[PDB]
Design a protein around this ligand. Structure first.
Ligand SMILES: CC[C@@H](C)c1ccc(O)cc1
Ligand SMILES: CC[C@@H](C)c1ccc(O)cc1
Lengths: 223, 223
């Protein structure tokens, strides 16, 4: 099938571990610290991953950072969603950090994690493929609606290149459903909505000052 | 072209006036009261409009209301956006209520109205047509991601019928751009984001209790 899709597949990062501190008592603070620390390390990996997207590295450093600052949480959430597809009512933040309803309640994340589980439910019903997941991650980055873009035409070209990849993949692999590409694009509003819910919640956590956060995570959060 | 598109065009409601009270001094309260009153009357019209969407009235009354309660602000905002396409840095809430930057600041709506203006800017660049606007309004309704749907398969059918209409319209009218339908769908995340910003802001206004709101508007806001 489509070369861009194949390329994104081989550029897919290895999974990383959450490593919750086994000496620390379980608490909302522990859970939130673990998740923010995981997100910080995933962000480093995402920045490295983005250089493999055709045309992305040719953008100005400012536009690269604008896209990332707008899209980072959508990319993080798409990851948890994809890792969670073979599970039921649990979120696989990492192989060693799987959150069920009880844990979500303990962390103060019941509403957010239920929203993420709504995304999981929809992609389950659509039988989301890894090929589609990696392409949607790239599309979310290109389509992230930053207000600070310098070269708008180049960003549009990036959107178009990735959209074409999705269109082509679906036309070849899913002839039984001539509207599958569009159905995939129609999942992006819920991703955007859920990401905004997450950013707002963790921004509040940042303000309260009880959960330690690393530099990159804080930078993205404050952007 | 496509029959569903033609149908949605003839089902398009007439414009309504804002009628700000000429005896009341200008204030943030006046502006916000005017806008909420306008929105209340537009919601009545939207409910009437939705019965013309193929298949919508065959849904249970509960599912009809779930869709509307999720999508109402996206539909309102799409309306202001479309009315504003031939203007610059102004929002045409009604023929008699056009908001510029100064008015937005006075109303406490600078951030929200700038976000809406970002939608306007994007649709301007794409040369959004009335045909596309009415179809996107219907798609936003069907794709509104309510968590309370009874007949999920029927709602999916509704999404599919309207998506097919958009696909068919673009294939016939815009052969020069085989990705135009997808580009249109890719504007929906920003619509969702902007709508959520609006709902959250006016929910806060509701809590503060200084701006009078009518029953239907309050019901939608509280849903
Ligand atoms: C605040 C980030 C948190 C919600 C999170 C989301 C996704 C992920 O992969 C790691 C952490
Ligand atoms: C709170 C509703 C307000 C933002 C509004 C939005 C669109 C519209 O057509 C009328 C009012």
């Amino acid at each position: 099938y489509n070369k861009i899709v194949s390329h994104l597949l081989v550029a897919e990062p290895e999974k990383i571990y959450a490593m919750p501190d086994p000496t620390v008592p379980d608490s909302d603070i522990k859970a939130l610290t673990t998740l923010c620390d995981l997100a910080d390390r995933e962000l480093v990996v995402i920045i490295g991953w983005a250089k493999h997207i055709p045309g992305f590295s040719t953008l100005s450093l400012a536009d690269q950072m604008s896209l990332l600052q707008s899209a980072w949480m959508e990319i993080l959430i798409l990851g948890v969603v994809y890792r969670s597809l073979s599970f039921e009512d649990e979120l696989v933040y990492a192989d060693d950090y799987i959150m069920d309803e009880d844990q979500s309640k303990l962390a103060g994340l019941l509403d957010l994690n239920n929203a993420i589980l709504q995304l999981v439910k929809k992609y389950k019903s659509m039988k989301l493929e890894k090929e589609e997941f990696v392409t949607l991650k790239a599309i979310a980055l290109a389509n992230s609606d930053s207000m600070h873009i310098e070269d708008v035409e180049a960003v549009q070209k990036l959107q178009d290149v990735l959209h074409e990849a999705l269109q082509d993949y679906e036309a070849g692999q899913h002839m039984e459903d001539p509207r599958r590409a569009g159905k995939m694009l129609m999942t992006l509003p819920l991703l955007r909505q859920t990401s905004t819910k997450a950013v707002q919640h963790f921004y509040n956590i940042k303000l309260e000052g009880k959960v330690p956060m690393h530099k990159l995570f804080l930078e993205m959060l404050e952007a």
